[PDB]
Structure 1
Amino acid sequence: AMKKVEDGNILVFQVSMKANKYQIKKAVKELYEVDVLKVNTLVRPNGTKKAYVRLTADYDALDIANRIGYI
Structure 2
Amino acid sequence: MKKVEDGNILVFQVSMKANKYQIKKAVKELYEVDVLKVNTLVRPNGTKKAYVRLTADYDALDIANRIGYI
- TM-score normalized by structure 2? 0.99
The runs of 4+ residues in structure 1 deviating greater than 4 Å are: none
C-alpha RMSD of the superposition: 0.4
Per the TM alignment, residue 47 of structure 1 is displaced from its structure 2 partner at its CA by 0.3
Per the TM alignment, residue 26 of structure 1 is displaced from its structure 2 partner at its CA by 0.1
Offset from partner CA, 1:7-37 (integer Å, 9 cap, x none) = 0000000000000000000000000000000
Per the TM alignment, residue 62 of structure 1 is displaced from its structure 2 partner at its CA by 0.4
SS, match of residue 40 in structure 2: strand
Partner Cα distance (2:4, 2:35) in 1: 14
SS, match of residue 12 in structure 1: strand
SS, match of residue 54 in structure 1: strand
Partner Cα distance (1:62, 1:49) in 2: 21
Partner Cα distance (1:8, 1:70) in 2: 17
- TM-score normalized by structure 1? 0.97
